[PDB]
Structures are given as C-alpha cells and as structure tokens.
Amino acid sequence: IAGRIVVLDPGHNGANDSSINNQVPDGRGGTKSCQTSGTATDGGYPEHTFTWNTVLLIRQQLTQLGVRTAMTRGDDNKLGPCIDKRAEIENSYNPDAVVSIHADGGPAGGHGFHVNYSNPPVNAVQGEPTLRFAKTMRDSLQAAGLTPATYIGTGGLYGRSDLAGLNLAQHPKVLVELGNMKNAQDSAMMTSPEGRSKYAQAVVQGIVAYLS
Ligand SMILES: [Zn+2]
C-alpha cells in the first residue's frame, strides 16, 4: 500500500459563475457542461462542502498509511476546475487509483450509497481493473455498515456512460455517491463531523482493499 498514488476528487466547486455552462467534450462522442453547482441538504449544507471536507479526511488517512495523494481542487469557496480538466489533472499523476466523491439529490425517502463506474468501457483500464475497483469499493462500504442506495443502481453499483469524469479516466477510477442529501438520515450523517469521518474511513478501506 505504501508508495502507491491516489488522486481524490471532491465533486463540484466552492463557487460558480457562467463559465460552468461552457460545453466540454465528454469522452463519449458528446459534450457536457464544464461544471454543475451540485446539490445541498435541505438544511443548506452544500454538496461541494460535504465532498471537500470528506476528501480532506480521506487524504489525511491515506497519507498516514504512506499513500501518495493529490486532489483536483484546492479550496471550497472559488471556481474550481471543469470536469474534463479534473480528469486531465487526475491522469497527470499516473495514479494507481482515483476516487471521486459526490452526494446525491434523490427522493426524500431514498438513502444509501452508490458506486458509479464507466459502462461500457471506452478503454482497457475501464474494463476489469475498474469493475473490480467498483465491486471492491461497494463491498468495503457495505461491510463498514453503510447501506447500498435504496433508490438508484443495483446493490450499490451503477454502471453508466454519461459521466465525462468516468469516460475520460486512464487509470482505475470510481465515483462514489455517498448518500442522498435530500434524505433525513443521510443529511444527518453528512452534516456530522463524525459522520464524515465514518464515510472517509469506509472509502479508505475500499481503496486499501483494492490496492492490496
Ligand atoms: Zn455531485
């Protein structure tokens, strides 16, 4: 585990302007908006702040394990990089694994996590190396006591073709939606410092399980 390289992507920007509406190539024949604002709990806790703070905790734990780390943004209050640029930044580190951290907006009674991965793969690394990462991450999150999403995906897994950040990956990568910000139980855990710590520990267990 020590000496491996992991890049962490806290989804969305600390702040936005109309540049986020400019269209960028999506890695699968189309274009998508440079960025989207992301969601928030009904208490006003923004997705971008949740992902930022959870990624900081993931990074700290990985560094303590001797894992070399990088992030795709440096703050939670200014414009951050577009989704295609984030994939470029990730790829530039030749990482052994990449984890993007998001939280979702779904029906209020729906809760739990889902691990998004590229399907169908557009290159070889997005095949077995990435599917194994996705299944391993799902297994580790559920073993940590997290609930697979009750409202989307299949048993905590979601293969999809619409996400530029997944389509553009040259290294094993997953995008973990940790929960539904619009749900009472997930919002409480996302808004809790110790909830964010538990999310981060579980993601780290998935990274460790995959790299081993
Ligand atoms: Zn998001």
Residue numbers in the entry: 14 to 225
Manuscript text:
PG remodeling is performed by numerous autolysins acting on specific substrates and at different stages during bacterial growth. While glycosidases, such as muraminidases and glucosaminidases act to hydrolyze the glycosidic bonds between the carbohydrate units, peptidases, such as N-acetylmuramyl-l-alanine amidases, l,d-endopeptidases, d,l-endopeptidases, l,d-carboxypeptidases, and dd-carboxypeptidases, hydrolyze the amide bonds of the peptide stem at specific positions. Ami1Mab and Ami1Msm displayed an overall globular structure comprising a central β-sheet (β1, 4, 5, 6, 7, 8) surrounded by strands β2 and β3 forming an antiparallel β-sheet, six α-helices, and one 310 helix (η1). The catalytic zinc is coordinated by the highly-conserved triad which constitutes the amidase_3 motif signature, namely H25, E60, and H115 in Ami1Mab and H51, E86, and H141 in Ami1Msm.
The crystal structure of Ami1Mab was solved at a high resolution in its free form and also bound to l-Ala-d-IsoGln, one of the end-product of the reaction. Ami1Mab was purified without its first 40 amino acids in N-terminus, predicted to correspond to the signal peptide required for secretion. MDP was rapidly hydrolyzed by Ami1Mab, indicating that it is an active PG hydrolase that cleaves the amide bond between the N-acetylmuramic acid and l-Ala. Incubating Ami1Mab with the chelating agent EDTA prior to the reaction almost completely abolished the enzymatic activity. These results demonstrate that, like Ami1Mtb, Zn2+ is required for catalysis of Ami1Mab. To facilitate the search for the potential inhibitor’s binding-site, the Ami1Mab crystal structure was probed with the CASTp server to identify cavities in the protein structure. This analysis led to the identification of a single cavity of a volume of 72 Å2 comprising the active site of Ami1Mab. The three inhibitors could be docked into the Ami1Mab active site with similar binding energy (ΔG°). The proposed docking poses strongly suggest that the three inhibitors are able to occupy the active site in a manner similar to the dipeptide seen in the crystal structure. The docking study supports the view that these inhibitors might act by competing with the binding of the PG peptide stem.
